[PDB]
Amino acid sequence: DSTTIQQNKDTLSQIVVFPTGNYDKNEANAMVNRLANIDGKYLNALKQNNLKIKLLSGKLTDEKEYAYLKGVVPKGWEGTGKTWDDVPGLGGSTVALRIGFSNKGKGHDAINLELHATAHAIDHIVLNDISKSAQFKQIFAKEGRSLGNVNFLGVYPEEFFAESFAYYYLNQDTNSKLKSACPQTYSFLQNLAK
């Protein structure tokens, strides 16, 4: 409801960091609004852990903390001809996101960039790598190839977790698609949020 969405935006106000210089303020806002759909318990946990969601106006590797990834081919991106220099988002111990690259087809094939990235942070920092737990590995073994991109999502349980998470929280349509395609994963996320 309205109050809860606002609470989540308030939490995100203490998580999201905007870039210095010129950038698309309207699209940055849109990204925050999509992130506000994530269950508040995860957002509160991100805040408590001082996890920042860094929005960027340029390449990830032009940031001092990611310069070491220049020329490095990300996990699962083998054969793409792309390196981290070309990748618009990152999630894990940190989160970094290029403004304007949210949608599928903008340098990636995730249903939504910021939700996928933030899911990685929630997985790693908040949930202590639950995607690599025995419970999730069993679910992944059954349903991990039912959301497409099977050489990525079907291979890395942390990626299946992150994209399922994104389907669950992006909108009603994707939420429904996940339920139909991956019922055990859907139930798992549903219970995770209790």
């Binding site: 990834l69 990300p74 996990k75 699962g76 981290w84 988002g89 894990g92 994209e163």
Partner: peptide, 7 residues
Amino acid sequence: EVNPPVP
């Protein structure tokens, strides 16, 4: 730790 989006 670092993880990319879906290629």
